Amino acid sequence: DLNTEGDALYSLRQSLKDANNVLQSWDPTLVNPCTWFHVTCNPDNSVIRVDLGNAQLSGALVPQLGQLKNLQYLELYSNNISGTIPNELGNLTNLVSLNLYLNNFTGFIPETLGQLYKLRFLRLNNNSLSGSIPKSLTNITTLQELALDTNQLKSVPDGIFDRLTSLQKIWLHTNPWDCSCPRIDYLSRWLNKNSQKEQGSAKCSGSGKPVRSIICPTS
């Protein structure tokens, strides 16, 4: 009997590159992947977290990774994972923490990420993600820590942070933010009103000014 979770997890092994045989224990012919290293399962023998931080992994992620229904912690930080973030990651309903920082992800941030209504920690920092931040992120009301620094983000949809009443920390620095008025109006005012939330200082592209300092005139 094929475990389906291990099958989905084996699809990830088939595309990644070790180079260290970190995934040597990932044998899908077993009854379940709960005895796999870097993999924890619940008492119902279902994968609830994947810890592959600092494993020197190359390659791209797979759409099969969204098959893990009971996944809570996806730790893929500190690797050389390239390509775009799969939209199927928005299927991870029970995902609490998505750690994808320190990789080489490109493209846009998936709008399907807003379907993660249990997500409390989202770290996509230190990548090459281009703007802008998905509008559906406003639906993640449980979001507490949002790390998006060190990317290529340019803008923000107006009023996106307003429904985020559980937001504690937010990283936005090191990004080519478009500080042209009236586009930067909302982000400038929000970061000023929630300066205790912003970790580091988001700079404006070109001028290098903190966007919190920008005051857009009307007419």
Whether the Cβ atoms of residue 151 and residue 174 lie closer than 8 Å to each other: yes
Distance CA 32, CA 138 (A): 36
By CB under 6 A, name the one of 88, 111, 158, 185 that touches ligand NAG: 88
Could you give the CA distance from residue 101 to residue 52 in angstroms, rounded to a whole number?
A: 12
Is 114 among the residues that bind ligand NAG (CB under 6 A)? Answer: no
Task: Single out the residue of 3, 64, 79, 91 in contact with ligand NAG (rule: CB under 6 A).
Answer: 91
Residue closer to ligand NAG, measured from CB, 58 or 70: 70
Q: Does residue 87 belong to the site contacting ligand NAG (CB under 6 A)? A: yes
Which residues between 57 and 86 bind ligand NAG (CB under 6 A)?
Answer: 66
CB of 189 to ligand NAG, least distance (A): 33
The residue range among 18-26, 43-51, 88-96, 168-176 that interacts with ligand NAG, by the rule CB under 6 A, is: 88-96
Q: Does 111 bind ligand NAG (CB under 6 A)?
A: no
* Residue that the structure tokens 């023998």 belong to: 45
The distance from CA 44 to its chain's CA centroid, rounded to whole angstroms, is 27
- 94 lies in the binding site for ligand NAG (CB under 6 A): no
Q: In the bound complex, what is the minimum distance in angstroms from residue 175's beta carbon to ligand NAG?
A: 25
205 near ligand NAG, rule: CB under 6 A: no
Enumerate binding residues for ligand NAG (CB under 6 A). 66, 87-88, 90-91, 112
